[PDB]
Design a protein around this ligand. Structure first.
Ligand code: BE0
Ligand code: BE0
Ligand code: HG
Ligand code: ZN
Length: 258
């Protein structure tokens, strides 16, 4: 069978035929118009508590790679900001381009970054991820832009395992990785209600998008671009341009923490 992806024949313009929510009222990503976003003094301080994070594995899922965490206890959590309660880190992944001038999902005044990091968390009041994605406040995704410049030292362990997970369905052990090494200095952010940016495109996400990008080197992003969408032994389809473009804002407001 065919499957959704990022090519001409199965990319974002096709997703609505199997995932009609693709044309919904709270789809992600969106363009962040900085002049229209409003400071919200009701936002509480944002709390990223990752000191006890336990990474387990890295997986090439045929769309991106996921760095997976042990979420059987509150070992790595996001709280505060726009969030009510506690959200547990389950995985992170990236979206990136074929060229440095595109790759992000969110845009900032229509600016595209080279890539975007998504740290995915689920609301512990719903007990598991699968139940959380049946809820309008089930997930919180912390989004971080990547620009090309100086290397991000904390990213290099991710870059160096990618050769071992080149093709779809390959995984590798990935213990003792500290995701705090992927953050910028500032936690200043924009927030809005949205969706998963991949099928099934479920409208369950509180998005928290940091204003400050991280810098990664050209060499680091070049290694992202050597991954494959295809499986082993299949003709090579480089894993590039695995981003969804901006969707209509509709009846939403983006709030700023700053
Ligand atoms: N609607 S979809 O899931 O993106 N896909 C399009 C290509 C054929 C298989 C279904
Ligand atoms: N790209 S995303 O919206 O962060 N992600 C959340 C977890 C499920 C797959 C989609
Ligand atoms: Hg939902
Ligand atoms: Zn994502």
């Amino acid at each position: 069978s065919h499957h959704w992806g990022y090519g001409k024949h199965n990319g974002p313009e096709h997703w609505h035929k199997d995932f009609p929510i693709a044309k919904g009222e709270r789809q992600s990503p969106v363009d962040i118009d900085t002049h229209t976003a409003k400071y919200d003094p009701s936002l509480k301080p944002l709390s990223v508590s990752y000191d006890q994070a336990t990474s387990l594995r890295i997986l090439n899922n045929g769309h991106a790679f996921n760095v997976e965490f042990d979420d059987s206890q509150d070992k790595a959590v996001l709280k505060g900001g726009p969030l009510d309660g506690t959200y547990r880190l389950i995985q992170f992944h990236f979206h990136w381009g074929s060229l440095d001038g595109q790759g992000s999902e969110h845009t900032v005044d229509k600016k595209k970054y080279a890539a975007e990091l998504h740290l995915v968390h689920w609301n512990t009041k719903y007990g598991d991820f699968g139940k959380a994605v049946q809820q309008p406040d089930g997930l919180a995704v912390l989004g971080i832009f990547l620009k090309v410049g100086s290397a991000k030292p904390g990213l290099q362990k991710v870059v160096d395992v990618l050769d071992s997970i080149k093709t779809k369905g390959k995984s590798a052990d990935f213990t003792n990785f500290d995701p705090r090494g992927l953050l910028p200095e500032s936690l200043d952010y924009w927030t809005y209600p949205g969706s998963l940016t991949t099928p099934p495109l479920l409208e369950c996400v509180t998005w928290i998008v940091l204003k400050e990008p991280i810098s990664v080197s050209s060499e680091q992003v070049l290694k992202f671009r050597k991954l494959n969408f295809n499986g082993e032994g299949e003709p090579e389809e480089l894993m590039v341009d695995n981003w969804r473009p901006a969707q209509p804002l509709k009846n939403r407001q983006i709030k700023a923490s700053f």
